Design an enzyme around this catalytic site. Structure first.
Site, PDB file in Angstrom:
ATOM      1  N   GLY A   1       0.806  -1.209   0.000  1.00  9.95           N
ATOM      2  CA  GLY A   1       0.000   0.000   0.000  1.00  9.95           C
ATOM      3  C   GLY A   1       0.842   1.264   0.000  1.00  9.95           C
TER       4      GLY A   1
ATOM      5  N   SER B   1       3.782   1.304  -1.625  1.00  7.11           N
ATOM      6  CA  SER B   1       4.452   1.252  -2.929  1.00  7.11           C
ATOM      7  C   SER B   1       4.254   2.524  -3.735  1.00  7.11           C
ATOM      8  CB  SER B   1       3.962   0.072  -3.768  1.00  7.11           C
ATOM      9  OG  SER B   1       4.365  -1.153  -3.184  1.00  7.11           O
ATOM     10  N   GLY B   2       5.353   3.000  -4.299  1.00  2.15           N
ATOM     11  CA  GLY B   2       5.352   4.179  -5.142  1.00  2.15           C
ATOM     12  C   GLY B   2       5.637   5.456  -4.376  1.00  2.15           C
TER      13      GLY B   2
HETATM   14  N1  LIG Z   1       8.867  -4.283   3.886  1.00  3.61           N
HETATM   15  C1  LIG Z   1       8.147  -4.153   2.716  1.00  3.61           C
HETATM   16  N2  LIG Z   1       7.844  -2.965   2.115  1.00  3.61           N
HETATM   17  C2  LIG Z   1       7.113  -3.259   0.968  1.00  3.61           C
HETATM   18  C3  LIG Z   1       6.539  -2.479  -0.022  1.00  3.61           C
HETATM   19  C4  LIG Z   1       5.866  -3.079  -1.062  1.00  3.61           C
HETATM   20  C5  LIG Z   1       5.744  -4.464  -1.127  1.00  3.61           C
HETATM   21  N3  LIG Z   1       5.056  -5.006  -2.221  1.00  3.61           N
HETATM   22  C6  LIG Z   1       5.526  -6.079  -2.906  1.00  3.61           C
HETATM   23  O1  LIG Z   1       6.554  -6.639  -2.566  1.00  3.61           O
HETATM   24  C7  LIG Z   1       4.741  -6.587  -4.093  1.00  3.61           C
HETATM   25  C8  LIG Z   1       5.580  -6.654  -5.352  1.00  3.61           C
HETATM   26  C9  LIG Z   1       5.397  -7.722  -6.215  1.00  3.61           C
HETATM   27  C10 LIG Z   1       6.139  -7.826  -7.378  1.00  3.61           C
HETATM   28  C11 LIG Z   1       7.069  -6.853  -7.689  1.00  3.61           C
HETATM   29  C12 LIG Z   1       7.259  -5.778  -6.839  1.00  3.61           C
HETATM   30 CL1  LIG Z   1       8.445  -4.580  -7.269  1.00  3.61          CL
HETATM   31  C13 LIG Z   1       6.515  -5.675  -5.668  1.00  3.61           C
HETATM   32  C14 LIG Z   1       6.314  -5.263  -0.146  1.00  3.61           C
HETATM   33  C15 LIG Z   1       7.002  -4.661   0.915  1.00  3.61           C
HETATM   34  N4  LIG Z   1       7.659  -5.146   2.011  1.00  3.61           N
END
Ligand SMILES: Nc1nc2ccc(NC(=O)Cc3cccc(Cl)c3)cc2[nH]1
Lengths: 250, 58
Positions: free
Chosen positions: A186, A188-189
């Protein structure tokens, strides 16, 4: 964000919330009035590219206070080297349909020059990560924007301390291996923002990790310094029809 | 002075030049001061500064 605190309203003014059909998708970082940096992997499952919305000045998702500014995402630019479903080259540059208006609650984070980022910012130990992601692994997402101070590791030290994707030259590790504090799904980005002599700069993008706050593992961030020239060139380019654009990298 | 060591003394960006020369530069929305290193905002909302905290210490 796991083990952080609420970012006081207006203290994370570059944070972007990305929505698809009104639903929370990902974070992002405002770097000037029309450009947002996010993670490529946020767009792997997008079906209708015309329903992507960026929100600036957001804080508490439960209320409207009038500081929020919503814009349609007109372009999503992803490096040619990114492969959907994998981790490397996890960056996207988003063009808004109309500029946001800068206010006390909406301010861009500085995109640094490469040399400055590599030679100086890369050695600042602590940086801030933020988002409305999960507050716990397998947990609910945050209603108020959260922020966390995390220390950066040299990749050799991350690999030695960690105990499966490689950590490439386009990534770096930051955070803690004791399961207390991390970014999470959530987030991410969103920004990894680094302070130097009174000013904050974009050094990373929340990308991936082994679960979140998993003992023996660190959060992994896209190393933005590798993409400065790529981003700068794209920001000088004219828009093209169609939302998604794959652009050559380098 | 060299940009690899201590950021060449620059507040923001640094360029090495041929000889023992160095030029500091500032991001858009800032100007370089006569000290040749410091950057001051030229706009209301320069990047990387947090308005509510800037007013809190102004
Ligand atoms: N500690 C911690 N911070 C995070 C932030 C995001 C995520 N999300 C993913 O791992 C999903 C994912 C699947 C495939 C390619 C990519 Cl690049 C990403 C996991 C995390 N774990």
């Amino acid at each position: 964000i796991v083990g952080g605190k609420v970012c006081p309203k207006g203290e994370c003014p570059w944070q972007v919330l990305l929505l698809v059909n009104g639903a929370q998708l990902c974070g992002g970082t405002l770097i000037n009035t029309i450009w947002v940096v996010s993670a490529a992997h946020c767009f792997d499952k997008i079906k209708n590219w015309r329903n992507l919305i960026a929100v600036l000045g957001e804080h508490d998702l439960s209320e409207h206070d009038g500081d929020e500014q919503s814009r349609r995402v007109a372009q999503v630019i992803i490096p040619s080297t990114y492969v959907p479903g994998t981790t490397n080259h996890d960056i996207a540059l988003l063009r808004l349909h109309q500029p946001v208006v800068l206010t006390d609650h909406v301010v861009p984070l500085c995109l640094p020059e490469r040399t400055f980022s590599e030679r100086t910012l890369a050695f600042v130990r602590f940086s801030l990560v933020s988002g409305w992601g999960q507050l716990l692994d397998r947990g609910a997402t945050a209603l108020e924007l959260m922020v966390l101070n995390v220390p950066r590791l040299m990749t050799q030290d991350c690999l030695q301390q960690s105990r499966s994707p490689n950590i490439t030259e386009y990534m770096f590790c930051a955070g803690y291996s004791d399961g207390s504090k991390d970014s999470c799904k959530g987030d991410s980005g969103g920004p990894h923002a680094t302070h130097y002599r009174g000013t904050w700069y974009l050094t990373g993008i929340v990308s991936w990790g082994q679960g979140c706050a998993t003992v023996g593992h660190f959060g992994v961030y896209t190393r933005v310094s590798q993409y400065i020239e790529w981003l700068q060139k794209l920001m000088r380019s004219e828009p093209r029809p169609g939302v998604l654009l794959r652009a050559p990298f380098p | 002075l060299i940009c690899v060591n201590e950021n060449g003394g620059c507040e923001q960006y640094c360029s090495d030049h041929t000889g023992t020369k160095r030029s500091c530069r500032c991001h858009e929305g800032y100007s370089l001061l006569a000290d040749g290193v410091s950057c001051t905002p030229t706009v209301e909302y320069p990047c990387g500064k947090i308005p509510i905290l800037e007013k809190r210490n102004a």
